[PDB]
């Protein structure tokens, strides 16, 4: 027949640069989850995301998750550059016992949890201009305290606000205080947002509470790499194409192994 219908069950390590997220989801590696600290300055043609990947840091959700995942995956890099943000009047490097970095409390390595300094929490109004020649991706978030008492204790203001703005657009997020079900012993949550800062544009972070500040930017590039969900193991074989079921020979005019494919292999037919 002219239809390929069987995969070897493995993903060839060549020629595409496969990066295996053993226990890490792309976003987990992006934020710097404690068990995902091995992904730094990474590169890939195809990020393989295992169905068994799990998060182990602070519980969080990503509004507009698909867009961020697609953007980062298409970038083909996780090059993170630290920036010297000047957070005056707030305590930095906040953490939680739900995110065990070492033996004690910890947090995402790429996010900066700002907390009240002493008995006050000023209106942060920092700004980092993008004088470089590449798009900068800033990952920040807004913390959602479980109670009004927790909100005031962490952040002196009774109701916080995060306004990240640039020339193109702005996002204003108001935290939703309330008790959620425990996840690793926490009834609070974190929402992760992202902002692309084009060259010559300026990032403006204005906040009076609940800001999970960024520590820097991810150097974005206009790549064509991709991300794929697959439990197939990676073997030292060679195949010009990859499918979630694994590599498939790409010589036949057609294939029906999967509709999702990466690389140069035939058109899908039901």
């Amino acid at each position: 027949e002219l239809v390929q219908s069987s995969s070897t069950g493995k993903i060839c390590n060549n020629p595409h640069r496969i990066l295996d997220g053993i226990d890490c989801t792309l976003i987990d590696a992006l934020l710097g989850d404690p068990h995902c600290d091995v992904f730094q300055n990474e590169t890939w043609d195809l990020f393989v995301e295992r169905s068994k990947a799990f998060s182990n840091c602070y519980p969080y959700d990503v509004p507009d998750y698909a867009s961020l995942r697609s953007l980062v995956a298409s970038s083909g890099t996780l090059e993170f550059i630290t920036e010297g943000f000047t957070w005056t009047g707030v305590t930095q490097n906040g953490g939680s016992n739900a995110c065990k970095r070492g033996p004690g409390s910890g947090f995402f390595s790429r996010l900066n949890w700002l907390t009240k300094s002493g008995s006050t929490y000023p209106v942060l109004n920092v700004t980092m201009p993008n004088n470089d020649n590449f798009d900068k991706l800033y990952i920040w978030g807004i913390h959602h305290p479980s109670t009004d008492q927790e909100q005031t204790s962490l952040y002196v203001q009774a109701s916080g606000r995060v306004t990240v703005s640039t020339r193109r657009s702005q996002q204003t997020i108001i935290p939703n205080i309330g008790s959620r079900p425990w996840v690793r012993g926490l009834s609070s949550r974190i929402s992760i947002y992202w902002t692309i800062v084009k060259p010559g544009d300026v990032l403006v972070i204005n906040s009076n509470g609940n800001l999970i500040a960024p520590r820097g930017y991810f150097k974005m590039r206009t790549g064509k790499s991709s991300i794929m969900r697959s439990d197939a193991p990676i073997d030292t074989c060679i195949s010009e194409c990859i499918t979630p079921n694994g590599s498939i020979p790409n010589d036949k005019p057609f294939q029906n192994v999967n509709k999702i494919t990466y690389g140069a292999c035939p058109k899908y037919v039901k």
Partner: antibody
Framework: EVQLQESGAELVMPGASVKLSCKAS????????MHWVKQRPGQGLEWIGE????????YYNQKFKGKSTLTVDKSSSTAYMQLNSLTSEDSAVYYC?????????????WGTGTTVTVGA | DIVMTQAAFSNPVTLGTSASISCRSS???????????LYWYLQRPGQSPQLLIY???NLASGVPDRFSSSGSGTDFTLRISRVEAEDVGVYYC?????????FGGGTKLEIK
């Protein structure tokens, strides 16, 4: 079998533009990316950028962005490099090289380097 | 950029015996995938380059088993078991762990 025949020697005045071509024969053209490499004697070997003929997606070395633009003609299986605002430093030998993998692949076969000399 | 160095103006290699070419990188070329993204390209005189070794210890289709490469960290070596009259040329070490591609200055073999 797989060969990448390029254009012959080009002579063009400073500040003009030239349109280098790379006829790819012996394989399915749309199934492999194309890289372009610049060679100047003594100075070494320099990478310009890569193009995916499937959809004309291109990624350039920063120092060559704008200085050159890559494009293909899928019908004739020919990959084209256009150099613009040429100067003395642009006198070189330009190699079109097939790519075996994706964006991060490697030069699999190199074409017959086309030399360009700038001057009236 | 990752800079590749190929200090090899004249590598004396008497014909017949083994020869070595050394390339060094300012950054480790080992990817998190376990592969080292070094490449060795041979440019015979008056000919376009051709692939000898991709990554390491992986040979091209037509490359004889004479050529073998290995290394660790940020220093790599290309070892030729036997050198013939046809192996004279410039051997560029290239890396693409981080694009753009960076090529070494290229080392030219000289026979005694």
């Amino acid at each position: 079998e797989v060969q990448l025949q390029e254009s012959g020697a080009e002579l063009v005045m400073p500040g003009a533009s030239v349109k280098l071509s790379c006829k790819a024969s012996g394989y399915t053209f749309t199934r492999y990316w194309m890289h372009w490499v610049k060679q100047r004697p003594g100075q070494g070997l320099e990478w310009i950028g890569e193009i995916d003929p499937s959809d004309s997606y291109t990624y350039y070395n920063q120092k060559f962005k704008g200085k050159s633009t890559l494009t293909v003609d899928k019908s004739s299986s020919t990959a084209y490099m256009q150099l613009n605002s040429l100067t003395s430093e642009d006198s070189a030998v330009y190699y079109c090289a097939r790519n075996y993998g994706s964006s991060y692949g490697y030069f699999d076969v190199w074409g017959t380097g086309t030399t360009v000399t700038v001057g009236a | 950029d990752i800079v590749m160095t190929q200090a090899a103006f004249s590598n004396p290699v008497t014909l017949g015996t083994s020869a070595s070419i050394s390339c060094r990188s300012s950054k480790s070329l080992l990817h998190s995938n376990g592969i080292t993204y070094l490449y060795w390209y041979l440019q015979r005189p008056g000919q376009s380059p051709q692939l000898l070794i991709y990554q390491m210890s992986n040979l091209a289709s037509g490359v004889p088993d004479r050529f073998s490469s290995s290394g660790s960290g940020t220093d790599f070596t290309l070892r030729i078991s036997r050198v013939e009259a046809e192996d004279v040329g410039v051997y560029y070490c290239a890396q693409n762990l981080e694009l753009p591609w960076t090529f070494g200055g290229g080392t030219k073999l000289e026979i005694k």
